[PDB]
Write a protein that binds this ligand. Structure first.
Ligand SMILES: [Mg+2]
Lengths: 406, 401, 404, 419
C-alpha cells in the first residue's frame, strides 16, 4: 500500500470519520428539536480527533462515545449517538473512506490514461510483432498496443463513476433498520444526516444488504485485472530475449491483482448475511475492503510510475520482427502478388515458398526469387517491399485516432 | 434451466456464427470487398438446418466454403475469436433478456409482499438472536430496494457489453487494408451492436463485468434463500416455500467462484490468448445457467410465498416483553429522566430474565414506575406490535420509485 | 490475529529466524573449511536479536547490519552462497513449524473438549435437522462425536504435511548453488541438519506446493470450524435455545478469508522458471494472514467448546413440537410386526397426515384407528411415540469414535 | 476443456447409476446374510441390479429430481413377485450418492495415478537426457545464471513425487463408506445398523466410517484441494513450456502431432477447490445446498484435471528440446551471465576485493556498450597483464559455471551415487 491510501484506512481517519458523523448527527437532531441545542454545540466542539487518548482504545465506536459522553460537561454527552447503532457509524464511515479512496483511484487513473495517450501518440507508427499464445502473428505498432490499454482504462473510469452514486450513501437505520428509538423522527433524522455528510439518503436500511460494498470490491477486481495484464505484457516485452521495453515494479502488481480478485470473491460471500444484522459477514468486509484498497493503490502507483518512465526500444522491436525472415507477412505477399501473377498462383506459390523458407530457415524473399515466374514478372525491390514487415501495419494509426478522439 | 440452456446450446451458438458470417458477407459486398455473386450465395447456406451436426468456427466455416457452390469469400478478414466473442455477446444479450424478465417478476412479487404484510409484526434478528420488532413487509422492501439496484447495474453494463468484436488476427484487420474500420462499423450496425473503439481480444473487462454482476445478483438471491429457510425452520415456522431455496445456495457459491475465474482470465498476454479465453468460454455458460436456475427458484418461491403472522406473533412474545424494552424506555422517559428510564428499566429486564417472568409483571413492582404509569399500558408499551417504528413509511419510500 | 500468533509472524521473530539461519550457515561453512573460523565466531556473536537497528531489502538490509557490526571485515563471510529467498523461505518454514505447534495444541484441547461432551451428553435426546427442518431423533453426544471424528482426520492431515513442509530451502541464485562449487550439497545437508529440517531433494524457489499445501490445510480446518460455529449459533437461536455460548460469528469471517487465501496460494503455484517475485509475494502476504485468521478461529472454538452451554430441557421441548410425528418411522416398525411392514406404513402415514392437518398428537390419532388400537394398547403406542425411544445406535457410534 | 474419455465416462450418468446398483446389490446381500431381508429377495434384487435394464427415458425425463429413487423405483418395479420392495432397506438417498461418488473418485484417482506415473517417467527420461545441456536460468523473466535443462526438469519431477505422496495419503481417508440413513444413526435398522454398515463397507472394498459424514465434507474437499495443488504444478509446467517456446526463445517445442488448455483447467480447478471448502459450511445433519456444490464441482474438477494431465503427459512424451537455441540464449549477455564466476576466478590473482570491484564495473561497461565481457576485461591493463586471454575466456564461458546441477538431479532420480 501507499502512504496516501494507508492513512485513509488508518484507525485515525476512521475515528475522525466517527466523530464527524456524531457531530453531524447532533446538529441535525438539535435542528429537529430532538436534543437540546446547547448540547449539540458542546458535543460538536469535543468531536476532535486530537482529543482521543489512543492509549485508552473490544468496542470499535462505543469506545469513542465512552470518551465523548464522559468527556462533555454537565452530562451534555447524554445526547450524542442518539438513536444510532454501532454499524451505522462503521458503515457510513466506511462509505466516507471509500469516497476518499476512490478520489485517489480517479487521480491515478487520470495519470495512467494520460501516460497512455502520450505513448499511443508517440509510438503510433513504431512497428512491432503482435503475439498470439506468445508466438509471433502479424505486425502491429506499439502505439496500437497502448491504445488498447487506454480504451480499457476508460471503460474502468465509466464503471467507477457509475457505482459512486450507489455507494456514496448514508447508513443510518438503528438496531433493526427502522430507527425505532427515534419514533416519527427517524426518516427526518436520516435524510438530514445524509444531506449533512454530502451523501445520498438511503432508500432503506442495508445493514445486511452488502451489494454496495461488494460492488466496490468487484470493481477493484476488474481494475487490477487490467493492471495485471499491463504488468505481464511489460515484463514479457522486457525479457532478456525480447528487450522491446524497459522499466524506469510490475511484479508487485501481479500479487496485488491475485489478492484483490480473491478478496472480491470473499465480499460476494459476505452478501449472504442473514436477517437484519450479521457480525460474521460484516467482519469479512471489515477485513477485505481496506486490504483490497491498499493492494489496488500499490498496483496503480507502480503502473503509473512504470508508464510515466516506460522506455521503448524500436530497434529491438524491428529485430524481433525480422526473426521470421519474411514469413510474418506472408499474407501480404499473397495479395500483393495477386494482381501480377493471378489470385491463386500467388496463394499457391508463396505458400509453397513459405514451407521451403521455413524448413530451410531462409528468407522468404530468397525462396521467392528461386521461382522463375516470380523473378521474371516482378523485380526484387518490389518483392523486398512486400517482404518488409513494416509495410503491413493495417489501420493501426486510424484505430489509435479513434481511441484518442473521445 | 431450459430457456437458458437453449441460448448457450451448441446450436443457437452456430446460428449466431452463421448470422455474423452472413452479415459480414453482406456489408463486404456493399463496400466492394467481396463479389456480389458470392455474398448472396453465402446468405442462403447460413442455415443451422444444413449443419450435418458431426462436429469451432472453422469447422463450420470450412463446410460453408465447400457448401455454397463456388463461398471462399466468406469469413474474409475475420479471425476465429471475432466470431466466437461476437456470438458470445449476442448470447449474453439474449441471456440478459431472460434475466430482465425474471427480475421484473421478482421485483413485482416483492411489491406485493411489502404491501400485504406492511403491518405484520415480526421479530428482527441480529446474529440469529431476536432484536426489536419490525414488519415482514419491511423485510421484503429491503430485498426490493436491493434488486432495483441490481436492475440498474444490469442496464449500465449493457452499453459496454453489447459491442462488436471484429479485429482479425491481431486486431488491426491488416488483410482488409483501408476497409478494415469501415467493415467493422457496418458489421456492428447490421448486428445491432455498438462498434468497438478498438480490438479487445485479450481485454476481458466486458465479459468479466458480466460475471461479477452475476455474482452480485446471486449474492442477493443467496441472502433471500437463506432468510427463507431460516424463517421456515421447524422451531420458527414464520414462512414456508410454495407447494427449493436450497438450490440457490449452491448456485451463488459456484457463480461467485466463477467470477473470480473471470477476473483471473483478464490476465491475458499480448493480442491473443487461448488459455484465458478458455476460462471464459467455460465459466460464462456455467454461470449463466446457475444464475437462471437461482432466478427461477427465487421467482417461484416468492410467487407463492407462505406467511403465518401468528407464528411471528408467537415468536415475538417469546421474550415476554423484553424485546420491546426500548419501547417502555421511551414511554417511561417522559415522566422520569430519559436516562433514568434507561437504568431503571434495564435493571428490571435483568430480574425478568433471570426468573423467566414477563417484563410487565416486574415493572409494576417498582414503586417509582408503578407511580408514573398505570397498568393498562404498561401493557401496550410491552406489546411488541406497538413498537414498529416507521416501517410503513420506509416501505412507501421504496415503493414510490 | 492472536497474541502468540502475531509474534510468530512479527518482524522480530522473522529477523530472529534470519539471524539463526546466518549463524547456522557460518558454522556449517566453517566446519567444511569454506570460510575461516574467525567469522563463524564473529558472525555468530552478532546474530543477536537485540543488536539490530530497526530501520526494500528484507534480508539484505539485515546482513548489511551484519557486515557493519562484525570485526575487521569478517562480516562478509556471512550469507555466503545464499540468496535472499533461501533465508526468507527457510524462515517461513520455521515460522510455519511454530505456527503448527500452536495449532496442534489448540486441536488437542478442542478434541479433548469434544471427547468430554460426547461422553457427557451421550444419551441426551435431541432432534436431528435436514435443511433446518426436523428429521429424526439423535443425541447431542452423537452430534459432538461427528465433529470429533472430523478434527481427528484434520490432526492426521497436519502430521502428514509436516514431513514435507519442514524442509530447508538453500539453493542460491538459481537452485544449483553455483558459487559453492562441489560444496553446495554438503553445505545444504549440514545446514538442514543444523536447523532440524529435512534436506531438500532439490531447489523449490518457484515450486510452492509445500506452502500452498499448508494453506489448503488451513482451509480444510477452518471449514470444519465454520460448521461448528454455524451449528452452535444455529442452536443458540432464540426460538431454539439448545446451547449457549460462554464468539462464533468471528469464525465465519475467518473461514471465508482463509478459503479465498488458499485459492490465492494455489494461484501462486503458477510461478515461471527459477525465480518469481510476483507469485512469491502472494505467499508472503497470504500465509501470515491465514495463520492469524486460523488461530483466531481456533481460539474461539476452543473457548466456546470448553464453556459450552447445554440445555437438555430445550432439546426435549423442540423434540415434542411435532407431537410424535418426529418418530412416525418408529411407530410403523413396532406395529408392522402385527399388520405387515407396509400395511403399517400406509396406516401410520395416513394417521400422521391427519395429525398434521388437525394439529393433534399422533398418539391421539393412532388411538382413533380401531385396527391399530386392536394390535397395540396405549402404554406401547405412547412408548413408540416417545422420541427418546428412537435414538438408534447413537451411543454405540459414540463408542466407535471415542475408543481409538 | 471437456476432459478425457475415461474420466468423462467415470462421471457419466451411465457409470454413476451402475455404482448405485452395485451398492443396492451389495446392501441386499449384506442384509440377507444378517437376516434382515429374505435371501430369495436379495438374489432377485442382485439379478436386476444391472444398468443395461434401465430405461433412460423414464430417468432422463420426469426425473422431478430423483437421482437415486428414480433408479430404485425401477429396481422395486423390476424385480419379480414384488421382491424389489426389499431393496434400499434402511438407506437414505445421500448414502447411495456419496458412496457412489467415493467409488467414482477411486476410479478417477486410478487414472490420475496412471497419468502421474507416466509424467514422472517422462521427467526422469528428460532429466537424464539433458542432464548436461546448458541453459540460462531466469528470474522475473530475466536471465540470472546458467543451469541445465535436466536440472529444470528434475525440479518438476520432485514436485510430482510429492503430489504422488499426497494422493496416496488422502486415499485411506476418502475411500470410505457413507451409510448412515436419515440422520446418520440408521434408526430404522435398530441394533443392526452398525452391522449392516461394516459388512457393506467390506462388500464394496471401502473402509468403514468411524461415524456418519453427510455434512462433514472434509474428505470431498480434500480431494478438491489435491486437484488444486496438482493442477497448480501442471500450470507452472505449461507456463514454462510456453515461455520456452516463444518465437524469440525457441528452446523447446510442443509435439503438436496443448499447454494453453492446462492454464484454463488449473484456473477453474482452483476456484472449484474454494467452492468445495465453502461447501464444508453445512448445517446440522443434512444440507442440500452445500451437498449440491460438491455434486456440481467435483465432476467438473475431475474432468478439468484429467484434461490437464492428458495434455502434460502428451507434451512431455514428445517434447522437442533445442540445445542450440538454449546455447544461443546463454551467449546473449556475452559473458555477463557468469560475472560471478569471473569474480571468484580472479580473486587469488588480483585480490578478492579488487576482483569484485574491477570485474563488476567492467560488466556494466560491457552492458552499456553491448560488448563481450571478455573484451572489456582485456582493456583493463592490470588484468591484461596478470591474465592471458585463453584463461579469461574459460572464466567467461557460461558452460563452465553450472554448479552441481548433475548431482542435484542424481538426488531426485535416487541414483546410488546420491546416497
Ligand atoms: Mg531457483
Amino acid at each position: 500500500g501507499t502512504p496516501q491510501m494507508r492513512e485513509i484506512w488508518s484507525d485515525q481517519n476512521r475515528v475522525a470519520c466517527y466523530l464527524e458523523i456524531e457531530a453531524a448527527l447532533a446538529i441535525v437532531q438539535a435542528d429537529l428539536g430532538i436534543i437540546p441545542k446547547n448540547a449539540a454545540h458542546e458535543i460538536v466542539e469535543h468531536c476532535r480527533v486530537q482529543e482521543i487518548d489512543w492509549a485508552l482504545y473490544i468496542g470499535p465506536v462505543l469506545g469513542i462515545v465512552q470518551q465523548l459522553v464522559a468527556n462533555c460537561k454537565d452530562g451534555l454527552g447524554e445526547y450524542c449517538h442518539w438513536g444510532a447503532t454501532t454499524q451505522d457509524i462503521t458503515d457510513t464511515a466506511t462509505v466516507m473512506q471509500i469516497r476518499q479512496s476512490l478520489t485517489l483511484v480517479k487521480q491515478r487513473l487520470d495519470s495512467i490514461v494520460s501516460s497512455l495517450e502520450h505513448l499511443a501518440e508517440q509510438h503510433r507508427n513504431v512497428p512491432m510483432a503482435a503475439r498470439s499464445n506468445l508466438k509471433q502473428a502479424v505486425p502491429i505498432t506499439f502505439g496500437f498496443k497502448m491504445a488498447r490499454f487506454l480504451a480499457t482504462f476508460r471503460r474502468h473510469q465509466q464503471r467507477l463513476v457509475e457505482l459512486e452514486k450507489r455507494v456514496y450513501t448514508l447508513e443510518f437505520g438503528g438496531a433493526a433498520g427502522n430507527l425505532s428509538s427515534l419514533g416519527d423522527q427517524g426518516i427526518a433524522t436520516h435524510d438530514a444526516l445524509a444531506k449533512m455528510l454530502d451523501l445520498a439518503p438511503a432508500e432503506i436500511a442495508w445493514h445486511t444488504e452488502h451489494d454496495r460494498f461488494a460492488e466496490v470490491g468487484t470493481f477493484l477486481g476488474l481494475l487490477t485485472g487490467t493492471l495485471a495484464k499491463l504488468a505481464t505484457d511489460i515484463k514479457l516485452m522486457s525479457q532478456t530475449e525480447v528487450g522491446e521495453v524497459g522499466e524506469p515494479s510490475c511484479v508487485y502488481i501481479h500479487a496485488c491483482a491475485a489478492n484483490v480478485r480473491q478478496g472480491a470473491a470473499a465480499l460476494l460471500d459476505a452478501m449472504q448475511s442473514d436477517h437484519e444484522r450479521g457480525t460474521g459477514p460484516w467482519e469479512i468486509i471489515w477485513v477485505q475492503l481496506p486490504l483490497m484498497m491498499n493492494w489496488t493503490s500499490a498496483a496503480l502507483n507502480n503502473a503509473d510510475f512504470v508508464l510515466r518512465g516506460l522506455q521503448v526500444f524500436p530497434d529491438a522491436m524491428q529485430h524481433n520482427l525480422d526473426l521470421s525472415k519474411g514469413l510474418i507477412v506472408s499474407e501480404a505477399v499473397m495479395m500483393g502478388l495477386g494482381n501480377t501473377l493471378g489470385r491463386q498462383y500467388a496463394h499457391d506459390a508463396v505458400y509453397e515458398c513459405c514451407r521451403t523458407a521455413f524448413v530451410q530457415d531462409r528468407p522468404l524473399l530468397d525462396v521467392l526469387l528461386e521461382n522463375h515466374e516470380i523473378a521474371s514478372k516482378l523485380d526484387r525491390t518490389e518483392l523486398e517491399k512486400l517482404c518488409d514487415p513494416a509495410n503491413y501495419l493495417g489501420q493501426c494509426s486510424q484505430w489509435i485516432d479513434r481511441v484518442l478522439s473521445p
